[PDB]
Nucleic acid binder design. Structure first.
Lengths: 124, 180, 50, 139
RNA sequence: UUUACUUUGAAAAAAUUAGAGUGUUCAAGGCAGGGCC
RNA sequence: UAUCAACUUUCGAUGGUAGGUCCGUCGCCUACCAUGGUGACCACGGGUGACGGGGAAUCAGGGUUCGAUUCCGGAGAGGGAGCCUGAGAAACGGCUACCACAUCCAAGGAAGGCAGCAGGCGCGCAAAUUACCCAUUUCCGACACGGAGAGGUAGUGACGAAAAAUAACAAUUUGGAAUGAGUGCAUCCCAAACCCAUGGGCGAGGACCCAUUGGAGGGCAAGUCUGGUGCCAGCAGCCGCGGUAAUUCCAGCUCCAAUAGCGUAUGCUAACGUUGCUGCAGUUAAAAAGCUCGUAGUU
RNA sequence: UACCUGGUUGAUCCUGCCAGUAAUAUAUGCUUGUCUCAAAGAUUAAGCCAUGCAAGUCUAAGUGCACACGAGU
């Protein structure tokens, strides 16, 4: 049933990646999560399930085949550097700050009106 | 400065005479013959034909030894014979002017499924596609206004998930079964 | 004057409309008009009572 | 006859330029007149306050009191006569209220047996007059 | 003696339009993808 | 636009000499000299609901109209004027004044420019959320890290455009059969959310989960139908309909281009060969100056 | 689609305009179940504005005794 094929495939070695168009079929499924895809993709290239990253998967009308982009890295520690911050956030780690962006703006303009080390107490 | 398109064209043209007694029946006849929703679809296919006729008309005004007429003319012919509105033997721009509105109505998906017997009537052929049954090369189509090509004419069949094809039945079939 | 506004609409009895069946719409309405005008054949107007 | 000469592009252009002014529909749209005298000032609709309810008599050979209203515009303070289109809708007109008047068919021309009324009221009290005639938007 | 006139090429922004190419399920559109590990 | 015909200089208007000035040329400015420069081929002056263009709408061709509007270029930041700094600003989300307007004062003073993004008032016929985030797109700096209402996303949205329901297959009314819209979970999507789209599940027989909008005298597709209202009320873009058998109005039924759109108002285009270059007219319908001379222009 | 139709008269042929017709774009009327796109305070007032934001910026590398945390961010 569900299987990946990786129609196209190229190795770049710039980011130490193996770029490929990962195409996964779904005869009776609804775009299985990438967790199931990353596990089945690591055993295909004998890599680890922590270095493969896939994105851009939208199931076409009716269902049956979902195409997307995929890439593999060398290690998880090396993947922490060459990876967008939101793609690492989608995993169980890297919970970014979620306070606000407007509260930080008004804090910056308030601290801009105070000169010296007293601005740290004004914002707090 | 927005990352958008703002490119959109119309598909139909309202006729000049709103109550032309001779025109009202000629378009109404195409309604029931091919199972169309309203007169907008008649004017839509009439507008696509009017564009192809005018595109072929301006090419015929140029000299035959003009490379623009040779390239653009053949490209228009190959697309007409590709969808099946024109035969390979009559592959010339002079035959484009002889194409009628029903020539493009026959290539409609709701009519091709009627010629193949997959549907009972021409009006049921619309509902057959409207309920996501007919597929073309494992690609299911829902809108009835699809146009098939010759390399995809012999691939019109039921979907692998439709009750009329091979797969699970409908929700009404499972409803009467559990209650009985 | 202006003392007769709404005369014929006030002198008209409040004859209510009759509840009729659901009229077909969309392709079904054009389908009925097709077979009724071309297929179902029997000069006369489509609404000429008498 | 017309000058056909190859260097007569200026003579032909200036002649047609000055002869277009002899066209009534062109001269009214390309001069200061017919735009400042127009109460709407080039607008399709206009709001106004109902000043009076006057019934103008139709012209011969007709005989019927056309129900209109003397309305003063808000945009420029001009006083016009908007015609109450439907039957009995003059009773729906309130006194000293806002009405959205528009043109009456022919542009700047009296329509029908009405002598000089060239405006009609569309909305009354921030609601359509057509709804007041069909038992909708009770106000 | 040199002009007007016609033809050819570079120039005569992109977008838009005309318009080759591509089944965004079709179309308006987009400049992108059918199939062999 | 001539109901603007002459115009520009007793403060440069045109040209000459020298110099000043600026990054640099120059009446840019100064001084001495010449009386020039432009103009019926429309200068000058005035008007513009004039930012220019790429383009848009409509068009057989020729055209007409539109272009504030996301691209390019210019202009401006309440009106002007004058500057600082900097490579680059006569900058206004930087200053210095005056003018207009306006805020806090303890009445001494101080501080103001949303034709930036949201929002408010006013103006009106006329036009959205004080919404979410630097991920895309990129830009700025000491920069992999930090910043961006530029931008991206969502809400409102019948500007407008592309797809597309309100049945269908049967019976002579009853059987199932096929499917979302809607309604509830995962996943996908997304920087997060959201519309989808998908996987099953919950989901229509007056399948009430029901389509209206102008019409039905002619132009112009559709009723001398039904009843009362009787030159009254009204209808009618036009011609015209009512003065007791109204096919027009005041209502039902029915019917008709319709159609998720459809009427109305106004601008504009075709219609319009009723602006005629293509392509109109001037004996009598609007019209060849009473007649001739005559330059420019045209041939 | 290189298109016209009603109206001067007892009737007719014309000139001729009005009206009819179809897109277009603003407003508005009634209506509005789904999806994908998408204009949106330009028109009168470049009228006037409450609040908030829109340019700041730190790398191994110009200068580094806040001990807040412990040479180093």
């Amino acid at each position: 049933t569900v299987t990946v094929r990786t129609r196209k495939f190229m190795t770049n070695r710039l980011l130490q990646r193996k770029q490929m168009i990962v195409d996964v079929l779904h005869p009776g499924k609804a775009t299985v999560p990438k967790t199931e895809i990353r596990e089945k993709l690591a055993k295909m290239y004998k890599t680890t399930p922590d270095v493969v990253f896939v994105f851009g998967f939208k199931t076409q009308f009716g269902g049956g085949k979902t195409t997307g982009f995929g890439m593999i890295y060398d290690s998880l520690d090396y993947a922490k550097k060459n990876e967008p911050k939101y793609r690492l956030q989608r995993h169980g780690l890297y919970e970014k700050k979620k306070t606000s962006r407007k509260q930080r703006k008004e804090r910056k303009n308030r601290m801009k009106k105070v000169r010296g080390i007293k601005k740290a107490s004004v914002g707090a | 400065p927005v990352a958008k398109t703002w490119v959109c064209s119309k598909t139909y043209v309202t006729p000049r005479r709103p109550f032309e007694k001779s025109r009202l029946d000629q378009e109404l006849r195409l309604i029931g013959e091919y199972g169309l929703r309203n007169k907008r679809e008649v004017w839509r296919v009439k507008f696509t034909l009017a564009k192809i006729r005018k595109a072929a008309r301006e090419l015929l005004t140029l000299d035959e030894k003009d490379p623009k007429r040779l390239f653009e003319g053949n490209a228009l012919l190959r697309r007409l014979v590709r969808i099946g509105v024109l035969d390979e033997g009559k592959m010339k721009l002079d035959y484009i002017l002889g194409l009628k509105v029903e020539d493009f109505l026959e290539r409609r998906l709701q009519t091709q499924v009627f010629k193949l017997g997959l549907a009972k009537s021409i009006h049921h052929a619309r509902v057959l596609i409207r309920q996501r049954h007919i597929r073309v090369r494992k690609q299911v189509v829902n809108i009835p206004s699809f146009v098939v090509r010759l390399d995809s004419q012999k691939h019109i069949d039921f979907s692998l998930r439709s009750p009329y094809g091979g797969g699970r039945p409908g929700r009404v079939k499972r409803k009467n079964a559990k209650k009985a | 004057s202006l003392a007769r506004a709404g005369k014929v609409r006030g002198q008209t009895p409040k004859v209510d409309k009759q509840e009729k069946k659901k009229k077909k719409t969309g392709r079904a309405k054009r389908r009925i008009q097709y077979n009724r005008r071309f297929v179902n054949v029997v000069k006369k107007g489509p609404n000429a009572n008498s | 006859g017309k000058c056909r000469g190859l260097r007569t592009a200026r003579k032909l252009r200036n002649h047609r330029r000055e002869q277009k002014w002899h066209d009534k529909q062109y001269k009214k749209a390309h001069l200061g007149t017919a735009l400042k005298a127009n109460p709407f000032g080039g607008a399709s609709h206009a709001k106004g306050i109902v000043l009076e309810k006057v019934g103008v008599e139709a012209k011969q050979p007709n005989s019927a009191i056309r129900k209109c209203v003397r309305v003063q515009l808000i945009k420029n303070g001009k006083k016009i006569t908007a015609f109450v289109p439907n039957d009995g809708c003059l009773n729906f007109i309130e006194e000293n209220d806002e009405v959205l008047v528009a043109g009456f068919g022919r542009k700047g021309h009296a329509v029908g047996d009405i002598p000089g009324v060239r405006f009609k009221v569309v909305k009354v009290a921030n609601v359509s007059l057509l709804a007041l005639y069909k038992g909708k938007k009770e106000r």
